[PDB]
Design a protein around this motif. Sequence first.
Motif, PDB file in Angstrom:
ATOM      1  N   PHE A   1      67.055  41.875  26.924  1.00 45.36           N
ATOM      2  CA  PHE A   1      67.593  41.022  27.806  1.00 45.36           C
ATOM      3  C   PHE A   1      68.747  40.162  27.020  1.00 45.36           C
ATOM      4  CE2 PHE A   1      64.430  41.877  30.786  1.00 45.36           C
ATOM      5  CZ  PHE A   1      64.902  42.223  31.982  1.00 45.36           C
ATOM      6  N   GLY A   2      69.734  39.586  27.732  1.00 40.86           N
ATOM      7  CA  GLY A   2      70.756  38.890  26.730  1.00 40.86           C
ATOM      8  C   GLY A   2      72.116  39.100  27.690  1.00 40.86           C
ATOM      9  N   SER A   3      72.161  40.439  27.926  1.00 41.87           N
ATOM     10  CA  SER A   3      73.769  41.010  28.354  1.00 41.87           C
ATOM     11  C   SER A   3      73.530  41.295  29.727  1.00 41.87           C
ATOM     12  CB  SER A   3      74.123  42.382  27.590  1.00 41.87           C
ATOM     13  OG  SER A   3      74.372  41.797  26.158  1.00 41.87           O
ATOM     14  N   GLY A   4      72.563  40.870  30.499  1.00 43.70           N
ATOM     15  CA  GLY A   4      72.557  41.275  32.127  1.00 43.70           C
ATOM     16  C   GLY A   4      71.544  42.247  32.378  1.00 43.70           C
TER      17      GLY A   4
ATOM     18  N   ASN B   1      73.147  34.857  32.231  1.00 48.20           N
ATOM     19  CA  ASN B   1      73.381  36.254  32.743  1.00 48.20           C
ATOM     20  C   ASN B   1      72.231  36.717  33.601  1.00 48.20           C
ATOM     21  OD1 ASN B   1      75.923  37.082  31.690  1.00 48.20           O
ATOM     22  ND2 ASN B   1      75.340  38.059  29.957  1.00 48.20           N
TER      23      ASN B   1
HETATM   24 CL   LIG Z   1      70.218  38.799  30.596  1.00 51.13          CL
END
Ligand SMILES: [Cl-]
Length: 240
Positions: free
Chosen positions: A48-51, A134
């Motif tokens: 996770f982190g970038s959608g 995100n």
């Molecule tokens: Cl995310």
Amino acid sequence: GMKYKAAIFDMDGTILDTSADLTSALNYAFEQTGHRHDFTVEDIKNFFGSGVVVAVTRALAYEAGSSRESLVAFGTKDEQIPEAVTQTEVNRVLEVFKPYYADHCQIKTGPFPGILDLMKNLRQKGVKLAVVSNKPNEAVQVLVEELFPGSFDFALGEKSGIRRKPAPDMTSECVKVLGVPRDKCVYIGDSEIDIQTARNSEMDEIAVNWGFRSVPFLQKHGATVIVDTAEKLEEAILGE
Ligand SMILES: [Cl-]
Ligand code: NA
């Protein structure tokens, strides 16, 4: 004066301890779609982190044998996505994951120690507070309403048709509503995406160490102020 008139927070790994519920929901979705379904919380911190699209793409690549290192560039121009992983399969997994997660995002999830006090204290000092994440917007809205009612002047998660972080669009939506100049804003988060989002939005950034990336990772990726308690984060935001 005030160092910052607005503090804009990421959600996952920053204000909310979400990795357990994310893990459970990811494993559920994977199992329902015929995949391996024994991911750990540490795996989820790498996905996770970038959608959610990048998260499921990463998880499928990891199932297929990709290194943790290789996952970092997913979602960027330098991504090396294995031929085993398709967006059609990503979308099929997301069809289960998104609604499941939305309906199960508040089982193990709560604020990190100190965060409720931080928000109270910052509002008392006249700092405007926002969440830009995100995490899909539907889940962001539920969580803010249930765990932080009345705390935030603005809260937004990811929505179809609007670019995810680290594009500036969502934070520009926040800036517009808050009415604070970008040089009086600070962005607070636990990942490289937060570092980038801040720079892309022409504002300062504070990194927290209690989230999904390690201190050596954050340092490698350009973090300059890294805090390890909510009290220290308050001091960073107030310039004390
Ligand atoms: Cl995310
Ligand atoms: Na995060």
